[PDB]
PDB file of C-alpha atoms in Angstrom:
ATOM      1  CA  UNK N   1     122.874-109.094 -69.720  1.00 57.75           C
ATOM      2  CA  UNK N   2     121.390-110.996 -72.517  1.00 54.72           C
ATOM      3  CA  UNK N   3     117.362-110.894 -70.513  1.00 53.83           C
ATOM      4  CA  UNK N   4     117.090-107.072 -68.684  1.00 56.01           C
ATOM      5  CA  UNK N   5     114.528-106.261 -66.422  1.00 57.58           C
ATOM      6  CA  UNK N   6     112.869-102.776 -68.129  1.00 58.64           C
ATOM      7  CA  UNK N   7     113.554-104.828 -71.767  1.00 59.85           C
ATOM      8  CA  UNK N   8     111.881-107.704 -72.785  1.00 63.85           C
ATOM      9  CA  UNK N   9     110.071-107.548 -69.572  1.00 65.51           C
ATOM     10  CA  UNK N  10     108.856-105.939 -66.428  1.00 65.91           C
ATOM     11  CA  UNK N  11     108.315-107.017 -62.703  1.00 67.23           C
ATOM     12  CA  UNK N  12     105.169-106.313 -61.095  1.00 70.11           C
ATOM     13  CA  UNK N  13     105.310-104.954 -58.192  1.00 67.95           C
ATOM     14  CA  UNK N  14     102.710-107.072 -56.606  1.00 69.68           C
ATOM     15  CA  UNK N  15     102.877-110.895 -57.306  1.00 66.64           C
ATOM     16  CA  UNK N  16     100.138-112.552 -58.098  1.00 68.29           C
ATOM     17  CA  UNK N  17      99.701-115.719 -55.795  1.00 68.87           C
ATOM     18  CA  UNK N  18      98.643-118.833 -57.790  1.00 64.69           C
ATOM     19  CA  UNK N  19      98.443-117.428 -60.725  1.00 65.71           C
ATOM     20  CA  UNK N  20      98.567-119.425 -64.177  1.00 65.51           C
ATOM     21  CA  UNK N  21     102.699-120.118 -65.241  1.00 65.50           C
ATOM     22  CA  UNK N  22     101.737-118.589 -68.610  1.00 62.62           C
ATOM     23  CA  UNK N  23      98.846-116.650 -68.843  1.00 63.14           C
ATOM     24  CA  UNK N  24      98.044-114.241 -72.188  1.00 60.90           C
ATOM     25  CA  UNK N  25      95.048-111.560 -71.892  1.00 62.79           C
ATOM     26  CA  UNK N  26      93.110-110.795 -75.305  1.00 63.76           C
ATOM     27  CA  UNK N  27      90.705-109.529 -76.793  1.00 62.83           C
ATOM     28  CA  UNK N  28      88.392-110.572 -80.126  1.00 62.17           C
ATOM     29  CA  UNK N  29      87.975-106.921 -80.797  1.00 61.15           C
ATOM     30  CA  UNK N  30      91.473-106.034 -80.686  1.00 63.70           C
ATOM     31  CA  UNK N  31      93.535-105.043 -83.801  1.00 65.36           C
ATOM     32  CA  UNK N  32      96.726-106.114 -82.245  1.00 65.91           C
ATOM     33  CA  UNK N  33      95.553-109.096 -80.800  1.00 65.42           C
ATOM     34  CA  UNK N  34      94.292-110.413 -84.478  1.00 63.19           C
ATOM     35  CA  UNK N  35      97.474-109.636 -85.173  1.00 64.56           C
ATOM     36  CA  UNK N  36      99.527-111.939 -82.185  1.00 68.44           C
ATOM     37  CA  UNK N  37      97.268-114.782 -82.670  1.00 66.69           C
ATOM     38  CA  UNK N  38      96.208-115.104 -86.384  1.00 66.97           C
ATOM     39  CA  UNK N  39      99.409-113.924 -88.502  1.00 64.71           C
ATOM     40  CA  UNK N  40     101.910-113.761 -85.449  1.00 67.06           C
ATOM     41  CA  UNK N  41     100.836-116.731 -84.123  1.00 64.43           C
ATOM     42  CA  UNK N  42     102.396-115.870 -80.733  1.00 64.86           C
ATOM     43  CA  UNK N  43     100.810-118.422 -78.534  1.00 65.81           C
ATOM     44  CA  UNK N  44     101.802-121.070 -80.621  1.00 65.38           C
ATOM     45  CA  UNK N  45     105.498-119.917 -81.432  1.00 65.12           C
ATOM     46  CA  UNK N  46     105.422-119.708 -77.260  1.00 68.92           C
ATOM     47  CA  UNK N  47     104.276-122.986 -76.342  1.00 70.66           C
ATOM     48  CA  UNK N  48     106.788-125.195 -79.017  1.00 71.69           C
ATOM     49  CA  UNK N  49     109.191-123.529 -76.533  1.00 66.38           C
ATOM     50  CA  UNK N  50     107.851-124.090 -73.052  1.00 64.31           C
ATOM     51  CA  UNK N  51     109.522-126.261 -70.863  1.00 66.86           C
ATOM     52  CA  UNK N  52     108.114-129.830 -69.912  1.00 67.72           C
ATOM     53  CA  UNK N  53     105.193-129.222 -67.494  1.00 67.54           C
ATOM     54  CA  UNK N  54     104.200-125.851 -67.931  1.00 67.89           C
ATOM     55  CA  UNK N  55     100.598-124.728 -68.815  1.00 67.77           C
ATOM     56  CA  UNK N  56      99.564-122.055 -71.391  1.00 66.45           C
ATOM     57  CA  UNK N  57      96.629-120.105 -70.496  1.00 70.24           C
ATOM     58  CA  UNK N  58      94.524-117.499 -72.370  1.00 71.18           C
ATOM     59  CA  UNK N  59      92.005-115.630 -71.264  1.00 70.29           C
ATOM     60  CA  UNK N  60      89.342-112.623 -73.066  1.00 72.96           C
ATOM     61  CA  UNK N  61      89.077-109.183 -71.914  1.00 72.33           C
ATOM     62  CA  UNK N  62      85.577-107.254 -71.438  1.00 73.58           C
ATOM     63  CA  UNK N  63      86.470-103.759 -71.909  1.00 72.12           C
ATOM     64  CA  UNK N  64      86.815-103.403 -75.932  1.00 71.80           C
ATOM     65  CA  UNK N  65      83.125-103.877 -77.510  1.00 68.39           C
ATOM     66  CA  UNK N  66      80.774-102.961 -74.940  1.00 67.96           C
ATOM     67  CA  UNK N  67      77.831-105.707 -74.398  1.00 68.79           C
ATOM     68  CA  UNK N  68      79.500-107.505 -77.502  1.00 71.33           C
ATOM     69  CA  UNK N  69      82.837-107.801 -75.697  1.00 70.95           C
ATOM     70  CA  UNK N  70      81.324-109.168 -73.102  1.00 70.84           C
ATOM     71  CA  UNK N  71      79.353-111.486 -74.697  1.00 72.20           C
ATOM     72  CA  UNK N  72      83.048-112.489 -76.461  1.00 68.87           C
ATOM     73  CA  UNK N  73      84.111-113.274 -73.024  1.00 67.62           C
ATOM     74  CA  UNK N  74      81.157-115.420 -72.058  1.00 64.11           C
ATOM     75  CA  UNK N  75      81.951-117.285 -75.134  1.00 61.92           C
ATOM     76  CA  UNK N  76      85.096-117.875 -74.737  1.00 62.07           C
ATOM     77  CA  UNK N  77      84.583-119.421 -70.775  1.00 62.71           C
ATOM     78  CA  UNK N  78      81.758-121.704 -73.058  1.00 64.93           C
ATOM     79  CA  UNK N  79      84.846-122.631 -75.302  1.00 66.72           C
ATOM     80  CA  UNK N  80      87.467-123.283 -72.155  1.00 66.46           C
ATOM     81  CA  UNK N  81      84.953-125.097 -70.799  1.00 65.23           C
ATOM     82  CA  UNK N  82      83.969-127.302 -74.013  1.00 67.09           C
ATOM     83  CA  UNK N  83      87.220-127.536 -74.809  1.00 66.16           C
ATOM     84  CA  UNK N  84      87.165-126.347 -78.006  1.00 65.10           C
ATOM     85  CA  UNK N  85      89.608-123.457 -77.871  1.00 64.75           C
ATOM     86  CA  UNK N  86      91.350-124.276 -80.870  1.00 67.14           C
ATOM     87  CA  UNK N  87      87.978-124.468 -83.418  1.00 68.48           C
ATOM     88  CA  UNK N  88      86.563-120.986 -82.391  1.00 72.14           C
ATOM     89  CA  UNK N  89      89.867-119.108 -82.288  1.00 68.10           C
ATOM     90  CA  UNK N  90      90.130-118.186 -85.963  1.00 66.78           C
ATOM     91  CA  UNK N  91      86.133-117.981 -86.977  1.00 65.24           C
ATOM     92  CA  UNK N  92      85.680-115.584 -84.208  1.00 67.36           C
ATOM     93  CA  UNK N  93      88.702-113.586 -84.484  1.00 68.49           C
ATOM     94  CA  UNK N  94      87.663-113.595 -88.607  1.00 69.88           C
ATOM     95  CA  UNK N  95      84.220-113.001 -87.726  1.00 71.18           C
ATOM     96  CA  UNK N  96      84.473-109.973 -85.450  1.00 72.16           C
ATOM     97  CA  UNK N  97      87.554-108.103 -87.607  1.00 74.68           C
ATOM     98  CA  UNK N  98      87.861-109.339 -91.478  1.00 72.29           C
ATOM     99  CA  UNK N  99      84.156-109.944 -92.009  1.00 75.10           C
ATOM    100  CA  UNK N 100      82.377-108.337 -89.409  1.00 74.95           C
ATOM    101  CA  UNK N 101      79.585-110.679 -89.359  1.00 72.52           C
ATOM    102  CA  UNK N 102      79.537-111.107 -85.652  1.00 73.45           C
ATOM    103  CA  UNK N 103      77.329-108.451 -84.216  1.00 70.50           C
ATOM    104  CA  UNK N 104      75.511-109.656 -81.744  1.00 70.19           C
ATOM    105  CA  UNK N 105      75.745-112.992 -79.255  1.00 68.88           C
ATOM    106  CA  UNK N 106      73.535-115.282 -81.897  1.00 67.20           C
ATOM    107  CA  UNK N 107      76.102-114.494 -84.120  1.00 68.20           C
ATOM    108  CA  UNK N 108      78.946-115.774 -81.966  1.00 68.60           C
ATOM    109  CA  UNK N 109      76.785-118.916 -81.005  1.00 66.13           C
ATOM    110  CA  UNK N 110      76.474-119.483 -84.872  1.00 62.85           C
ATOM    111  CA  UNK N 111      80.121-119.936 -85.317  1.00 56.37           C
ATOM    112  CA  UNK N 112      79.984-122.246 -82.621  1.00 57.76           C
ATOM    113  CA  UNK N 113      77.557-124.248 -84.160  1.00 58.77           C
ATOM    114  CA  UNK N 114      79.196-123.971 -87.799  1.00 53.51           C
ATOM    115  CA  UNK N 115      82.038-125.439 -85.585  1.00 54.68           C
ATOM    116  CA  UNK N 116      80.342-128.602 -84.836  1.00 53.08           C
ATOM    117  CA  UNK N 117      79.908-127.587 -81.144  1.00 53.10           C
ATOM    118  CA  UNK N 118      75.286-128.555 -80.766  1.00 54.63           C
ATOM    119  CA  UNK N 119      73.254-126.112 -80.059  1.00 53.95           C
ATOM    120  CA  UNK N 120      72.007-127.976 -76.515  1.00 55.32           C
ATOM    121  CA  UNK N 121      75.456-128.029 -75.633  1.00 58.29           C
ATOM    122  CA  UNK N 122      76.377-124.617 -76.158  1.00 56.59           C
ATOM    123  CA  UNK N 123      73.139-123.237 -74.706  1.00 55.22           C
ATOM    124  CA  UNK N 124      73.721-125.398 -71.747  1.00 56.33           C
ATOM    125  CA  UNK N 125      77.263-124.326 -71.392  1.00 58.31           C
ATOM    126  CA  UNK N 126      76.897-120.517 -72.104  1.00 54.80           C
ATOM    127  CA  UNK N 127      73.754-120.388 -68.894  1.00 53.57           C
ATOM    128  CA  UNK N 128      75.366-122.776 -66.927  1.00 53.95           C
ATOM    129  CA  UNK N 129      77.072-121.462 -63.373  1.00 54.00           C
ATOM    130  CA  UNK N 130      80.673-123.521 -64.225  1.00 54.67           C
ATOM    131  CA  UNK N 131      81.037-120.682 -67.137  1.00 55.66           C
ATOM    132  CA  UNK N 132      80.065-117.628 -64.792  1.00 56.97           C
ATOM    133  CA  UNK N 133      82.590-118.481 -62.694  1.00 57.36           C
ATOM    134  CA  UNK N 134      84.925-118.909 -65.753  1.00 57.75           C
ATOM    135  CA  UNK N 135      84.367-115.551 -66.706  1.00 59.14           C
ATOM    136  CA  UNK N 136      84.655-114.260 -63.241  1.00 57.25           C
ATOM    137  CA  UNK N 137      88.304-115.803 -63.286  1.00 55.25           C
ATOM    138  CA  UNK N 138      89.017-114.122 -66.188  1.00 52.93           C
ATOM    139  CA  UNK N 139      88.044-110.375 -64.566  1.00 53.69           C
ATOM    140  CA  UNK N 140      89.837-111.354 -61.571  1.00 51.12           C
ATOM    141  CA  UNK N 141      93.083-112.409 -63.290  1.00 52.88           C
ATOM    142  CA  UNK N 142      92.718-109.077 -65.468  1.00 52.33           C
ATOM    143  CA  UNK N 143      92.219-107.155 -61.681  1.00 50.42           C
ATOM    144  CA  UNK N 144      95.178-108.983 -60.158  1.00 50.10           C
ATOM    145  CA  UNK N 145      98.203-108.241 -62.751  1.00 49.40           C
ATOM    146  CA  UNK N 146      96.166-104.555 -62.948  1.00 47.31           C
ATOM    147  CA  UNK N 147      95.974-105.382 -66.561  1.00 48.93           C
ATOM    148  CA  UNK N 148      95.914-102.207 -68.749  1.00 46.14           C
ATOM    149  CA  UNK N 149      96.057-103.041 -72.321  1.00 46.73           C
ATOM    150  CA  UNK N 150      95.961-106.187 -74.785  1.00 50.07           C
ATOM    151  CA  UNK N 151      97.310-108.174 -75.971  1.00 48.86           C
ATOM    152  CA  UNK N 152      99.753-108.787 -73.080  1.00 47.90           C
ATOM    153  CA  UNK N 153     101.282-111.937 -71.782  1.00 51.06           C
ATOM    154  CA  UNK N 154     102.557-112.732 -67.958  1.00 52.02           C
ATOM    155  CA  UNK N 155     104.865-115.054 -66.881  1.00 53.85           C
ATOM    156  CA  UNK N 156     104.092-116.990 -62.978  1.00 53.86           C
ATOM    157  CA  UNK N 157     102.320-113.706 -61.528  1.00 52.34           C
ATOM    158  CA  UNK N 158     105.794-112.331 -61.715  1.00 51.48           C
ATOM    159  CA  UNK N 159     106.383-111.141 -64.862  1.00 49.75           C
ATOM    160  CA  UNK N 160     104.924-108.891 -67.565  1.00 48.53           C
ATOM    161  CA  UNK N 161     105.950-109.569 -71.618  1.00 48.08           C
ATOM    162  CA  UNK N 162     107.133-106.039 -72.660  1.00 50.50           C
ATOM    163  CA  UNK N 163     107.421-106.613 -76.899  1.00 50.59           C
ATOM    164  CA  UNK N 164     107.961-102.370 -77.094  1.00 47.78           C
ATOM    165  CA  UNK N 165     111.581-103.280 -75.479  1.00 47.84           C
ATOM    166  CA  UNK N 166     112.236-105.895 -78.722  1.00 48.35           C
ATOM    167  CA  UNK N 167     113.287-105.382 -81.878  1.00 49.85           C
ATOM    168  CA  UNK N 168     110.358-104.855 -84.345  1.00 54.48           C
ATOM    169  CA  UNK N 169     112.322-105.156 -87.968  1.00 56.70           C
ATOM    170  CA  UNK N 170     111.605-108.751 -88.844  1.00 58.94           C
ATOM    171  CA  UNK N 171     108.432-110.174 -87.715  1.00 56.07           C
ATOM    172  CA  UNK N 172     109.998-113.232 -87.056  1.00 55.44           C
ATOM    173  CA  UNK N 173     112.888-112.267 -85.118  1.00 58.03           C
ATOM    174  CA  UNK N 174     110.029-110.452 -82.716  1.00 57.74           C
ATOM    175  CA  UNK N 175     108.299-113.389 -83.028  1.00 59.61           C
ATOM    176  CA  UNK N 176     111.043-115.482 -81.965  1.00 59.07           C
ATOM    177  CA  UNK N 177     112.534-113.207 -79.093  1.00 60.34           C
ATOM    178  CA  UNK N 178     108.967-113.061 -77.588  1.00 57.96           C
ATOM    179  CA  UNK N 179     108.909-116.651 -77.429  1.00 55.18           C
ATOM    180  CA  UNK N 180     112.650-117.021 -76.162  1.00 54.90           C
ATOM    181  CA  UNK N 181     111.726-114.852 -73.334  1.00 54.59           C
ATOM    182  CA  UNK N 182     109.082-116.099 -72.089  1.00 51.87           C
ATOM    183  CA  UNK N 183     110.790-119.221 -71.850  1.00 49.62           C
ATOM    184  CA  UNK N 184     113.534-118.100 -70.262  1.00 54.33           C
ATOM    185  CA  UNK N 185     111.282-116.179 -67.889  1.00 54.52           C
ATOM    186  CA  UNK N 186     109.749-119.390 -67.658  1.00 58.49           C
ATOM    187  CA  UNK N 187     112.708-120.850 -66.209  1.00 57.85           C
ATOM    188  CA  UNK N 188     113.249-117.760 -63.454  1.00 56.95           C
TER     189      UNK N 188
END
């Protein structure tokens, strides 16, 4: 068929039970992933294709940077939970791999507060116990589809994006068959 099991995607072999319908894995430090997000655009190119009523979720990864990646991850829960996903994505991903001016966790909180996000409010959010549980979602959701790599996108706890099993010519065509299937995983 047109969608093949092995091609555009994989089955995992253990479900994950109430998992997010669309959930992407990433990481700040990750080549690839700066790729996806910032000249890909992936996410976006997959949610103007969604269906009606289903949720995008993204989550960071802890095991590229060390005690910086981890940091990266503690910001991002501070961002879920602020709600301001979509005014850190391309200052962090800039600052951490085209200039390289985030080095340490001050320097993540300062792009937060370039941002607009206050400095009480971040400070609050990044100590607060409603973002250590955020990022202890984000290590369990990594545990439970056994995530190996990033950038990588699953589909209901089901199913696992495979974009080595597309064609990689145009950009756009990728770009486009990536989104197609996860819609049409979407709709399994």
């Amino acid at each position: 068929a047109q969608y093949e099991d092995g091609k555009q995607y994989t089955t995992l072999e253990k479900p994950v039970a109430g998992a997010p319908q669309v959930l992407e894995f990433f990481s700040f430090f990750c080549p690839h992933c700066y790729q996806f997000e910032e000249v890909l655009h992936i996410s976006d190119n997959v949610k103007k294709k969604l269906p009606e009523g289903v949720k995008m979720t993204k989550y960071h990864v802890n095991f590229m940077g060390g005690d910086l990646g981890k940091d990266l991850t503690q910001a991002w829960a501070v961002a879920m939970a602020l709600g301001v996903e979509d005014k850190v994505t391309v200052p962090l991903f800039e600052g951490v791999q085209k200039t390289q001016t985030i080095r340490s966790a001050s320097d993540i909180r300062d792009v937060f507060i370039n941002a607009g996000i206050k400095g009480e409010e971040y400070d609050a959010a990044w100590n607060s116990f409603v973002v250590k549980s955020l990022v202890a979602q984000q290590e369990k959701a990594a545990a439970d589809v056994q995530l190996r790599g990033v950038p990588a996108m699953f589909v209901n706890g089901k199913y696992q994006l495979n974009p080595q099993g597309m064609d990689t010519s145009n950009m756009d065509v990728f770009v486009q068959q990536y989104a197609d299937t996860v819609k049409y995983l979407s709709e399994k």
